[PDB]
Each structure stands twice: as structure tokens, then as C-alpha cells.
Design a protein around this ligand. Structure first.
Ligand SMILES: O=C(O)COc1ccc2ccccc2c1
Length: 420
């Protein structure tokens, strides 16, 4: 409803599990490179979210001027792109967005399986993956997740507690005499960490879904920027402290909770993170469930809910076969996020306002602080070029080499991804 709910949603849906793999990224990038990449990608993700908001507002105004009703349904990103640029862009956006959301849900299932292992190690991470895959498949019966605001302003508290626990525990533990702090050793690890940060920031393809619930979506531009600033405040200290403490040992420990000594605070952090990803999975899979039902023609509950199972099976199977907690994030970030969250929105923004009449009669001009249309187009071109050459090319090469390396050394359907 109000702007506060939107801010909470943006701050809680921005980081779910990357808060635990961020120190692993730092162990590959180094302190300076990691900090610079997080800040640069935070700014770039805020910019892309602003572009997505501009496109959503433009589409909504273009439809209201024609007295379109929408029959009270969320205007999904593919619908906006269809109505604003054509059917080919509809297909492109739909495919990329749905694939990224499916892989993100897989990522949350893997994160839950990995996290629970550190409260109860009596069962291998694969058994935990089975159990939590069943628990997540239970979410099919839930129609939607937009209606809930508790799940936002509680998940933000859980993320804040986890980040501050990481920071304080790392600072108190202190680095041992045998610690080592090696910066960039090989470009593969460096670009894997950079791609993990890229995955961390950007919006996670849920911008329009966090925006439809707002009374006045025009303020989302600033709301998401402030939420990103708060998320940076959360992530920078935790990652920096965890790296400063356990430098060069995080390379083989993707999860940051595998290193810290077990205690009541660590158990609380694990429980809160599990409860946070159990809601992030739902908030990321509801969009997939809606599109699945729309394609199969079932969308208009037990009979309808049972029709959502074919969406769970790909998610449940993918988590089991590839439990690679850390490198999966880099792989998805380079292959899917680079297009889903950065390149595709920028290209859509450039094409939508390319025609002169469309640019002149737009709902709102870009801010003069960013140089108006000229500066907006320059920034969009830079974002596209950067996220392509580094996010996709170098990032894709490094992330896929690392993923194949994990497959080589641990195999498929591995019991432990890492239990040193
Ligand atoms: O691991 C991370 O930082 C989080 O990733 C994601 C990815 C897609 C999402 C889609 C919807 C809601 C939350 C989402 C979180």
C-alpha cells in the first residue's frame, strides 16, 4: 500500500542467501575489488530498477488512456513488454524472466538444504534437499504472496540480524596466525565473484511485482534506491568482516556459517535464514506458477493447485542434481541475470522511447541530474555493453568453467557439496 511497505519489500527481496556466499566472492575478488563491485552493481541495479519502473508506468498510462481495465490483475513484466514493444519482445522477456525465476527458486531450495545441515548434520545435504523440496512443493496450494506484508518487514529483520551476526562474530573471533589473504589469483575466480555480486544486485526480476502493490508507483524510483542503500549497509560489513577473519579459507567454504563456531546465535541465524528462504522461494515461484497456469489455460483450488506440480518437479530435480551452493549463483548470474535484469530492461527502455512522438509525449522526462535523454541513453548503452562483455562474456566463461570444475571434483547428485 504505502511507500513504507514497498521499501520493506524491496529491502527484503533483494538478498535472501547471497548474504552467505558474499564472503566467498570476496575471497576470490579481494577486499578492494569486492567493495568496488558491490557499490558499482548496487548503483547499476538501482538504475535498472528505475528503468523498469519507467517502462511499467509508461505501459500503464498507455493502457489507461485507452480505458483498459486489467480486470484487477498484476501487470507482469512480459505483459508490459508485449504491450510496449511487440510479441517478439514478449517471448524474449517471458523466457528469460521465467527461466531466471525457476533457477532462483532452485537456488533458494539449495540454500535451505545447505543451511539446515549446520543445525543438524545427522543427515546429508541431499536428504535435507528432499525434505525441503517437499516443504516447498507444499507451497503450490498457496495462491499468491503479494497479499502479505509481514513476510516483508519480518524478512528484512531476519536479513539484518544475519548480517550483523556475521559481522560481530567475525570481528570477535579474530583472524588466526595461519590466515592468508590472497587477492586475485586467477581470472576465473575473480570473475566468478564479480558475477556473484552481479547476481546479488539488480532487482531479481521482481520489480513490477513489488511495484503493482503501490498506490503511487512513481516513488518506487527513490524507494528502491534507499532500499539498495540499506542492503549495501547490510552486506558490505558482513562480507568484509567475514573475509578479514577467514581469508583464503572461504574459497572452499561457500556458506559463511560453515566456518563460524557453532553457538546459540549461529543456530538463530540459521533458523532465520531458513525461514527467509522458505518465503523467498514462494515469492519467486508464485510468478512462475501464474505463467504456467496461463500457458496451460488453467489460470482463471485443489484441482488447480495439483496442476502446479509440473513446475515444482524441474525445481526439485535441479536442486538435487546441482547442490553447488556458491557457484550456482555465479552461473545463473552470468547466464540469466545479465540478460533478465540488466540488458533486457535497458534495451527495452532504449527502444520504447526511440521514436520521436513516443519520447515527446512520455509520462515523465528523465531527471536532469542524469543529463536528460542523452545521459539516460548513454547510461543504458554503457550498462548493456558492460553487462555483456563482463557480465556475460568474461563472467559467463569464468562461472561456467568454475561450475564444470565443481562437477568434475564433486560429481552429480553429490551427498556433500562441501563437508570438510
Ligand atoms: O540469492 C539472492 O540474493 C536472492 O535471489 C533472488 C532471486 C529471485 C527472486 C525472485 C523473487 C523474490 C526474491 C528473489 C531472490
Amino acid at each position: 500500500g504505502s511507500v513504507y511497505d514497498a521499501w520493506f519489500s524491496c529491502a527484503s527481496n533483494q538478498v535472501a542467501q547471497v548474504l552467505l556466499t558474499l564472503p566467498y566472492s570476496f575471497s576470490q575478488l579481494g577486499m578492494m575489488s569486492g567493495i568496488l563491485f558491490q557499490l558499482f552493481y548496487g548503483l547499476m541495479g538501482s538504475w535498472t530498477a528505475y528503468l523498469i519502473s519507467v517502462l511499467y508506468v509508461e505501459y500503464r498510462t498507455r493502457k489507461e488512456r485507452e480505458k483498459f481495465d486489467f480486470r484487477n490483475h498484476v501487470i507482469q513484466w512480459f505483459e508490459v513488454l508485449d504491450g510496449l514493444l511487440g510479441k517478439h519482445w514478449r517471448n524474449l522477456g517471458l523466457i528469460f524472466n521465467c527461466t531466471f525465476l525457476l533457477f532462483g527458486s532452485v537456488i533458494q531450495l539449495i540454500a535451505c538444504a545447505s543451511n539446515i545441515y549446520y543445525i543438524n548434520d545427522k543427515l546429508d545435504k541431499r536428504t535435507w534437499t528432499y525434505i525441503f523440496g517437499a516443504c516447498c512443493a507444499t507451497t503450490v496450494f498457496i495462491p499468491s504472496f503479494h497479499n502479505y506484508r509481514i513476510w516483508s518487514f519480518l524478512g528484512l529483520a531476519m536479513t539484518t540480524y544475519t548480517s550483523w551476526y556475521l559481522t560481530i562474530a567475525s570481528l570477535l573471533h579474530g583472524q588466526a596466525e595461519d590466515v592468508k589473504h590472497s587477492g586475485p589469483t586467477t581470472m576465473v575466480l575473480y570473475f566468478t565473484g564479480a558475477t556473484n555480486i552481479l547476481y546479488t544486485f539488480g532487482g531479481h526480476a521482481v520489480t513490477v511485482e513489488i511495484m503493482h502493490a503501490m498506490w503511487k508507483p512513481q516513488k518506487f524510483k527513490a524507494i528502491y534506491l534507499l532500499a539498495t542503500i540499506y542492503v549495501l549497509t547490510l552486506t558490505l560489513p558482513s562480507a568484509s568482516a567475514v573475509y578479514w577473519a577467514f581469508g583464503d579459507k572461504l574459497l572452499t567454504h561457500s556458506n559463511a556459517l560453515s566456518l563460524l563456531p557453532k553457538t546459540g546465535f549461529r543456530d538463530t541465524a540459521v533458523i532465520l535464514m531458513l525461514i527467509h528462504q522458505f518465503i523467498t522461494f514462494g515469492f519467486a515461484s508464485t510468478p512462475l506458477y501464474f505463467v504456467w497456469e496461463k500457458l496451460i489455460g488453467v489460470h482463471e483450488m485443489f484441482k488447480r493447485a495439483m496442476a502446479r506440480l509440473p513446475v515444482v518437479v524441474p525445481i526439485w530435480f535441479l536442486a538435487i542434481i546441482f547442490p553447488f551452493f556458491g557457484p550456482i549463483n555465479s552461473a545463473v548470474g552470468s547466464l540469466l541475470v545479465s540478460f533478465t535484469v540488466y540488458i533486457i530492461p535497458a534495451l527495452a527502455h532504449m527502444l520504447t522511447f526511440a521514436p520521436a512522438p513516443s519520447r515527446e509525449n512520455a509520462v515523465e522526462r528523465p531527471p536532469r541530474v542524469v543529463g536528460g535523454w542523452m545521459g539516460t541513453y548513454c547510461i543504458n548503452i554503457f550498462v548493456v555493453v558492460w553487462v555483456f562483455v563482463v557480465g556475460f562474456g568474461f563472467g559467463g566463461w569464468a562461472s561456467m568453467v568454475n561450475f564444470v570444475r565443481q562437477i568434475d571434483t564433486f560429481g552429480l547428485f553429490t551427498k556433500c557439496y562441501q563437508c570438510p
